[PDB]
Design a protein around this nucleic acid. Structure first.
Lengths: 83, 78, 80
DNA sequence: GTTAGGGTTAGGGTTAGGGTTAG
DNA sequence: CTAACCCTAACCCTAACCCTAAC
C-alpha cells in the first residue's frame, strides 16, 4: 500500500545503544534485556531488533573508520570493515 | 550520464510488475547475465530505483493515477 | 570463538556420514573426526557444528521448495 | 555423553530517501 | 524544471555460532 518504511534512529535510541555497548559489548540480546521491551533498565530500544542494533553499531564504526578517527572502545569488537 | 532507452524502460516496467521494487531481483531477470533478458545490464540497482522514482514523481506532479507497479516505489513531492 | 566457513572437503565428509549413519553426529566423527576410521576431514568440527551445518542444508531445501535428499529427512530443522 | 531445537550473531548484500547536477 | 546522478543510514538473508534440556 506504500513503500517499505525506514525508521530513523532517535537520540534516545542512540544513547541507549551506546550505554548497552559500553556495558556488555556487542551482546545484542543482552542489550535488549537491559533496554528493549520490558527492559530491566529502560525501554528506549524497545522498537529495535538485535539485527537493527548491530547494523547501527556497524554504521557508527564505519563512520569513525571512514573519517580516520580513533575508534571508541565500545566499537572495537563491533563488526565492520572499510572494504 | 546515459539517457534511458525504450527497451531499458520496458524492462524496468516488466520487472516492477513481476517483483515490485526488488531492484536486485530485477537485475537477476534483466541485468548482466539476466535469466530473462540483458536489457538492463548497464544499470545498477540504485539507477533502477532512481528511474522508477522519476516515473512516480511525474505521476504525482500531474495528478495522473499512479500505476500499481509504482505504489511501493519511493518518491515524495516537496 | 572464531567462525570458519566450511570447506568442500568438510561438506563432502558430512554428506558421506549422513548417507551412512544418518544424523548420528558422534558416529560421523568416529569416521571423519580426530583419529577417524576413514579420514580426519571433519576433525575441526564438533558434533553440534555437524548438526548445525546439516540443518542449514535442510533449511535451504525447505526454502527453495526443491526436494530434499533422503540423508536430510531425519536432520532437525523447520521453517518458522 | 548424545542430540533436538530454540536462540544468537558476523558479514555480505540490499534499499528508502534526501540532496546534487547536467542539460 | 527534471532526468540522471551520489551519499547516507537503514534494512534483509543466512551460515556459523551458543544454550538448554531430555534421555
Amino acid at each position: 500500500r506504500k513503500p517499505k518504511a525506514k525508521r530513523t534512529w532517535s537520540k534516545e535510541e542512540e544513547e541507549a545503544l551506546v550505554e548497552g555497548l559500553k556495558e556488555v559489548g556487542p551482546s545484542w540480546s543482552k542489550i535488549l534485556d537491559l533496554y528493549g521491551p520490558g527492559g530491566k533498565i529502560t525501554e528506549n530500544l524497545k522498537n529495535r531488533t538485535q539485527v537493527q542494533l548491530k547494523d547501527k553499531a556497524r554504521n557508527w564504526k564505519l563512520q569513525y573508520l571512514k573519517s580516520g578517527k580513533p575508534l571508541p572502545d565500545y566499537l572495537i569488537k563491533v563488526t565492520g570493515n572499510l572494504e
